């Protein structure tokens, strides 16, 4: 359902075609103003004609989009407009929808902008952890499960597609002390402090510790864990390395900027 | 012709902040027909809602800090009294935390003494 | 009684043909006027108006823009309400749907009124 | 594709420009109906006067502005109205030992060249032992600057050489 | 027998059994004395750096047999938004700690190597003045590591370099490993010393530039924990 | 009782608090879906409404207190008539000393207690780990 963008682009293209025709026929109403060496108006004429051709081509290309207009006559919208004439004395519902959309977008933008708040300083619950863990596990290809073997510590474990599972410990909040290990583990009947790797997942554990020390927000730990999980999800490909080659070293990954590249290059 | 040499401005920095705050909300509240379209306009609205607000907030903060400077250079006794009060409050808070920790420790000691009957 | 996409697909090639004929009639009228105003009489033949062509081209452009605007508004108002309720029409009864819509409108209006009153009382 | 209008407007070489008006303006005035499409009033005598008639090449002024408070330049009896525009007396007043000021007469401030003048080399540098060593390394260092610049580059090179040969 | 199906080359063939006895107790005692020494060093650095931004450490509950976990943040006095440097080091038994400051800067220390803490304190004061300028004004991001040498850099390269213009003025600072860490200079635009020789010839007399240094002379100033740089930055415009 | 320095500190804290409450109410309005969306008829809706009402009421209180403290500070203009401190920067006590000494002694005792506390924590967490 991305037809709204195509429709907006088509509207803009038609408006551009109209404006280009208007500009062409307004400039053609004026000869060479002042050349004194050679009539350079032919260049502007050719540019305007090429712009008209560009707009026509853009309209023809947008014609390829907009596959079909589905049925479902406004998707349960007609209840009093197309329904009983008593019911529609109706615009209140549409006004409420538009106002809610505008309020949501405006509040989102305002929050994203005021994220850099001028807060000087801060001066003058083992039930929601399972819920937050389940809400985070609701994401695809991120099957996790917490064990809590010793005390209130949430010694959970994650695994995305590979056998590179990560035993990320927690403290009922602001989870820290993570250790990544690939291709087998859980010795005995619990987690471990092995951290064994092939000199590659050691860098991954270092980056994960840096991230855990990086996302330390003053409040809202649920958003912190969600950001941590969507940051960790970027390790599902490992098939990119800008600013260098793919194999500059043995390993290649550091995406704090949502673009993983070769290490020792940041 | 304000962009010229003169620039009238008076009775601001408090009511001006309040006015900006209550005014850049008008994009949300209005006894008008909310149009059935919204794109790249609420953004440029909230931009100037937030920027001028933060600017006037920082202006007020700088005014408060300048007042603090003039007060410290004109009357350090108030700063000394405030420091003494803060130290007293910190001492009281530390004593309360220590008392709570001692109560919890004694409770746990009694719990262990009652549980180690074996 | 066709779909807006069908009207768009049937209007675009007529639009292109109208643009081509517009350019042709403009060129013919211009060359006729020049030959009749600069050189010798050569274009002694009745030419078109060039206005009855541009008016029709603008009409086609405007009608296509209106059709696409109607389709966009329809899809937009159908998308936002589809994510606010299930489908039930000849999974839910109609009176319950009407009551839920009325309660939703009332709650949104109440939230807006409370926020406006508080913002007005703030200053 | 509709190159008819293009080729006709290209063919329309003659000087008489009234056919386009009579051919297009009626249609546009019929469809678009602005009595004043540009109602703004424009009556402009643009240039009244623009000259300070006291300015030396502005490019040099930028460098004399960018100078550190340690340096200070001036003007001697000046053959520097507009072309040479400079032969200054820059005393390197700083923390370390002072020296003799050079002339540094530069070319037009567009600077497809450098300053170095080396006027008082004769008696000033030969007289003193330290000043003699000052000139020595400083010449070799100035023979290295690729397209040196008048005030900042040459003055900083002079100060650096003066406080380096000082050892 | 698990080596049959899952044929491990040399990992499980060696991990199936290992030595024990006295080596384990020795490693445990080494870890104990290492943790004690690290804690004592942190406590001593806290008791010494009083006026400096007080260091803030935080231990962990999960202390394993050999390895453990320690967390620490700078957390300058009365400023939670100035936590620009917070590292988490683990103090293993048969080796040294492996700290990572913020940006994956993993390093390995020694028995009595604590100058890293001092260098981090210096650059954390630098980042603190940077952030407090970016909050209150027009501070660019040229707070580099160290450049060209203010004091010859004694104390493991600790030499701050940052500046920020609020309005027409501009303020720059350079802190280091106690070797002139209180170096702050603020150069205004207009002053007494000048040279009207080639300046008067310049049209629109240039009083906008800012030449004279006019060092701040950080003596008896109201700097409580060096986090009061904004308390001086406020002297920009009434 | 002047307490003018604490007045300015409270004013700055109130400014920061107004900014933070604006950010909080905007973050709350961000995730405010339609009332009759799926299941939450009024419970979550009424809860969010009450939270927003409390936010806005406390914000009005903050603005009132800010106006009050600004008026008090502007009215407290006394002494140092020029006040060139913004451009003139350089370019009783026994009770404070006794309080500092007492605070240092209390902090020393606190560190002495914390040493044994962390020692016991390490001992327990390391001994229960060698189990089995």
Curated annotation (Swiss-Prot), chain A:
The modification Phosphoserine is found at residue 118. Pfam families: Med27 (PF11571). InterPro entries: Mediator_Med27. It comes from Mus musculus (Mouse). One of its GO terms (molecular function) is transcription coactivator activity. This is Mediator of RNA polymerase II transcription subunit 27. Component of the Mediator complex, which is composed of MED1, MED4, MED6, MED7, MED8, MED9, MED10, MED11, MED12, MED13, MED13L, MED14, MED15, MED16, MED17, MED18, MED19, MED20, MED21, MED22, MED23, MED24, MED25, MED26, MED27, MED29, MED30, MED31, CCNC, CDK8 and CDC2L6/CDK11. The MED12, MED13, CCNC and CDK8 subunits form a distinct module termed the CDK8 module. Mediator containing the CDK8 module is less active than Mediator lacking this module in supporting transcriptional activation. The keyword Cytoplasm does not apply. The modification N6-methyllysine is found at residue 120. The keyword Ubl conjugation does not apply. PANTHER family: 34 KDA TRANSCRIPTIONAL CO-ACTIVATOR-RELATED, MEDIATOR OF RNA POLYMERASE II TRANSCRIPTION SUBUNIT 27. Keywords: Activator, Methylation, Nucleus, Phosphoprotein, Transcription, Transcription regulation. One of its GO terms (cellular component) is nucleolus. Belongs to the Mediator complex subunit 27 family. It is found in: Nucleus. GO terms for biological process: positive regulation of transcription elongation by RNA polymerase II; positive regulation of transcription initiation by RNA polymerase II; protein ubiquitination; regulation of transcription by RNA polymerase II; RNA polymerase II preinitiation complex assembly; somatic stem cell population maintenance. Its main location: nucleus.
Swiss-Prot record, chain B:
Residues 78-114 form a coiled coil. One of its GO terms (biological process) is negative regulation of smooth muscle cell differentiation. It is found in: Nucleus; Cytoplasm; Membrane. GO terms for cellular component: core mediator complex; cortical actin cytoskeleton; cytoskeleton; mediator complex; membrane; nucleoplasm; nucleus. The keyword DNA repair does not apply. Keywords: Actin-binding, Activator, Coiled coil, Cytoplasm, Membrane, Nucleus, Transcription, Transcription regulation. GO terms for molecular function: actin binding. Component of the Mediator complex, which is composed of MED1, MED4, MED6, MED7, MED8, MED9, MED10, MED11, MED12, MED13, MED13L, MED14, MED15, MED16, MED17, MED18, MED19, MED20, MED21, MED22, MED23, MED24, MED25, MED26, MED27, MED29, MED30, MED31, CCNC, CDK8 and CDC2L6/CDK11. The MED12, MED13, CCNC and CDK8 subunits form a distinct module termed the CDK8 module. Mediator containing the CDK8 module is less active than Mediator lacking this module in supporting transcriptional activation. Belongs to the Mediator complex subunit 28 family. This is Mediator of RNA polymerase II transcription subunit 28. It comes from Mus musculus (Mouse). The lineage of its organism: Eukaryota, Metazoa, Chordata, Craniata, Vertebrata. The chain holds residues 32 to 149 of 178 of the full protein.
From Swiss-Prot, chain C:
Keywords: Acetylation, Activator, Nucleus, Transcription, Transcription regulation. It is found in: Nucleus. One of its GO terms (biological process) is positive regulation of transcription elongation by RNA polymerase II. It comes from the Eukaryota. GO terms for cellular component: core mediator complex; mediator complex; nucleoplasm; nucleus. Its main location: nucleus. Component of the Mediator complex, a coactivator involved in the regulated transcription of nearly all RNA polymerase II-dependent genes. Mediator functions as a bridge to convey information from gene-specific regulatory proteins to the basal RNA polymerase II transcription machinery. Mediator is recruited to promoters by direct interactions with regulatory proteins and serves as a scaffold for the assembly of a functional preinitiation complex with RNA polymerase II and the general transcription factors. Component of the Mediator complex, which is composed of MED1, MED4, MED6, MED7, MED8, MED9, MED10, MED11, MED12, MED13, MED13L, MED14, MED15, MED16, MED17, MED18, MED19, MED20, MED21, MED22, MED23, MED24, MED25, MED26, MED27, MED29, MED30, MED31, CCNC, CDK8 and CDC2L6/CDK11. The MED12, MED13, CCNC and CDK8 subunits form a distinct module termed the CDK8 module. Mediator containing the CDK8 module is less active than Mediator lacking this module in supporting transcriptional activation. The chain holds residues 52 to 185 of 199 of the full protein.
Curated annotation (Swiss-Prot), chain F:
Its main location: nucleus. Residues 92-127 form a coiled coil. Pfam families: Med30. InterPro entries: Mediator_Med30_met (IPR021019). One of its GO terms (cellular component) is nucleoplasm. The keyword Transcription regulation applies. GO terms for molecular function: nuclear thyroid hormone receptor binding; transcription coactivator activity; ubiquitin protein ligase activity. One of its GO terms (biological process) is positive regulation of transcription initiation by RNA polymerase II. Keywords: Acetylation, Activator, Coiled coil, Nucleus, Transcription, Transcription regulation. It is found in: Nucleus. Belongs to the Mediator complex subunit 30 family. Component of the Mediator complex, which is composed of MED1, MED4, MED6, MED7, MED8, MED9, MED10, MED11, MED12, MED13, MED13L, MED14, MED15, MED16, MED17, MED18, MED19, MED20, MED21, MED22, MED23, MED24, MED25, MED26, MED27, MED29, MED30, MED31, CCNC, CDK8 and CDC2L6/CDK11. The MED12, MED13, CCNC and CDK8 subunits form a distinct module termed the CDK8 module. Mediator containing the CDK8 module is less active than Mediator lacking this module in supporting transcriptional activation. This is Mediator of RNA polymerase II transcription subunit 30. It comes from Mus musculus (Mouse).
């Amino acid at each position: 359902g991305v037809n709204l963008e195509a429709f907006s682009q088509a509207i803009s293209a038609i408006q551009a075609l109209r404006s280009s025709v208007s500009r062409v026929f307004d400039c053609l109403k004026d000869g060479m103003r002042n050349k004194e060496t050679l009539e350079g108006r032919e260049k502007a004429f050719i540019a305007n004609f090429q712009d008209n051709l560009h707009s026509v081509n853009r309209d023809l290309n947008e014609l390829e989009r907009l596959s079909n207009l589905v049925g479902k006559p406004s998707e349960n919208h007609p209840l009093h407009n197309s329904g009983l004439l008593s019911l529609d004395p109706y615009s209140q519902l549409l006004q409420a929808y538009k106002w809610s959309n505008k309020l949501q977008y405006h509040a989102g933008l305002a929050s994203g902008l005021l994220n850099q708040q001028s807060l000087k300083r801060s001066a003058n619950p083992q039930y929601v952890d399972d819920v937050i863990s389940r809400i985070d596990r609701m994401f695809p290809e991120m099957s996790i499960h917490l064990s809590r073997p010793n005390g209130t510590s949430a010694m959970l474990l994650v695994t995305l597609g590979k056998v590179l599972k990560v035993i990320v410990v927690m403290r009922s909040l602001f989870i820290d002390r993570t250790i990544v290990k690939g291709y087998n583990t859980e010795d005995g009947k619990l987690d471990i402090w092995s951290k064994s790797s092939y000199q590659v997942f050691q860098k991954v554990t270092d980056h994960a510790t840096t991230a855990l020390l990086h996302y330390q927000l003053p409040q809202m730990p649920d958003v912190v864990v969600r950001s941590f999980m969507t940051w960790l999800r970027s390790y599902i490909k490992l098939f990119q390395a800008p600013c260098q080659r793919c194999g500059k070293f043995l390993q290649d990954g550091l995406p704090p900027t949502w673009r993983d590249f070769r290490t020792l290059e940041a | 012709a304000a962009p010229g040499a003169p620039r009238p401005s008076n009775s601001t920095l408090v009511d001006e902040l309040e006015s900006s705050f209550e005014a850049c909300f008008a994009s949300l509240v209005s006894q008008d027909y909310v149009n059935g379209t919204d794109q790249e306009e609420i953004r440029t609205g909230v931009d100037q809602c937030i920027q001028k607000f933060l600017d006037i907030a920082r202006q007020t903060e700088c005014f408060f800090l300048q007042k603090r400077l003039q007060l410290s250079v004109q009357k350090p006794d108030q700063v000394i009294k405030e420091d003494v009060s803060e130290l007293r409050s910190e001492l009281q808070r530390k004593d309360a935390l220590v008392q709570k920790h001692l109560t919890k420790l004694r409770h746990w000691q009694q719990v262990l003494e009652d549980i180690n009957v074996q | 009684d066709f779909d807006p996409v069908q009207r768009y697909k049937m209007l675009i090639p007529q639009l292109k043909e109208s643009l081509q004929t517009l350019m042709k009639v403009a060129a013919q009228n211009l060359i006729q006027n020049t030959n009749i105003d600069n050189g010798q009489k050569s274009s002694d033949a009745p030419l078109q108006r060039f206005d009855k062509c541009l008016e029709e081209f603008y009409a086609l452009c405007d009608q296509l823009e209106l059709c696409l605007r109607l389709a966009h508004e329809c899809l937009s108002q159908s998308c936002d309400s589809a994510k606010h309720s299930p489908t039930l029409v000849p999974s839910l009864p109609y009176p319950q749907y009407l009551a839920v819509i009325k309660a939703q409108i009332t709650c949104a209006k109440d939230i807006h009124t409370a926020l406006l009153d508080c913002a007005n009382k703030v200053t | 594709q509709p190159l008819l209008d293009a080729v006709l407007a290209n063919i329309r070489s003659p000087v008489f420009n009234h056919s386009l008006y009579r051919t297009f303006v009626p249609a546009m005035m019929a469809i678009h109906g602005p009595p004043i499409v540009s109602p703004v009033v424009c009556s402009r005598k643009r240039r009244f006067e623009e000259d300070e008639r006291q300015s030396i090449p502005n490019v040099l002024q930028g460098e004399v502005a960018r100078l550190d408070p340690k340096f200070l330049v001036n003007l001697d009896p000046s053959h520097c109205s507009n072309n040479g525009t400079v032969h200054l007396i820059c005393k390197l007043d700083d923390k370390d030992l002072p020296s003799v000021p050079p002339l540094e007469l530069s070319v037009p401030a567009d600077y497809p060249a450098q300053s170095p003048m080396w006027i008082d080399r004769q008696w000033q540098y030969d007289a003193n032992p330290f000043l003699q060593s000052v000139h020595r390394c400083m010449t070799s260092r100035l023979l290295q600057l690729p397209d040196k610049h008048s005030v900042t580059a040459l003055l900083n090179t002079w100060a650096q050489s003066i406080h380096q040969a000082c050892l | 027998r698990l080596s049959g199906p899952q044929a491990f080359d040399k990992n499980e063939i060696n991990s199936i059994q290992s030595t024990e006895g006295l080596l384990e107790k020795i490693i445990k005692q080494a870890k104990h004395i290492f943790l004690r020494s690290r804690t004592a060093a942190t406590i001593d650095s806290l008791a010494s750096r009083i006026e400096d931004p007080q260091i803030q450490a935080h231990w962990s509950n999960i202390n394993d047999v050999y390895e453990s976990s320690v967390k620490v943040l700078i957390t300058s006095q009365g400023y939670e938004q100035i936590c620009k440097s917070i590292q988490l080091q683990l103090n293993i038994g048969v080796e040294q700690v492996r700290v990572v400051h913020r940006d994956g800067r993993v390093i390995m220390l020694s028995h009595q190597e604590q100058e890293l803490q001092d260098f981090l304190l210096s650059q954390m004061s630098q980042h603190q003045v940077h952030a407090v300028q970016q909050l209150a004004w027009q501070v660019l991001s040229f707070s580099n590591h160290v450049g060209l040498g203010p004091i010859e850099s004694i104390g493991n390269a600790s030499a701050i370099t940052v500046a920020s213009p609020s309005g027409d003025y501009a303020i720059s600072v350079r802190n280091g490993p106690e070797s002139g860490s209180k170096i702050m200079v603020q150069f205004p635009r207009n002053q007494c010393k000048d040279l009207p020789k080639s300046d008067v010839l310049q049209d629109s007399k240039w009083s906008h530039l800012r030449g004279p240094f006019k060092e701040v002379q950080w003596n008896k100033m109201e700097g409580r924990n060096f986090v009061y740089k904004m308390e001086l930055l406020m002297s920009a415009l009434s | 009782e002047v307490n003018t320095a604490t007045l300015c500190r409270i004013g700055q804290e109130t400014v920061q608090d107004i900014v933070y409450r604006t950010m909080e109410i905007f973050q709350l309005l961000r995730n405010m879906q339609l009332p009759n969306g799926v299941t939450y008829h009024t419970g979550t809706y009424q809860d969010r409404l009450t939270k927003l009402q409390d936010h806005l009421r406390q914000l009005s209180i903050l603005f009132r207190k800010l106006r009050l403290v600004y008026d008090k500070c502007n009215e407290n203009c006394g002494g140092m008539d020029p006040i060139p401190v913004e451009q003139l920067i350089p370019y009783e006590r026994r009770e404070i000393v006794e309080v500092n000494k007492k605070l240092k002694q209390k902090n020393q005792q606190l560190k002495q207690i914390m040493d044994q506390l962390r020692n016991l924590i390490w001992d327990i967490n390391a001994m229960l780990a060698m189990r089995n």
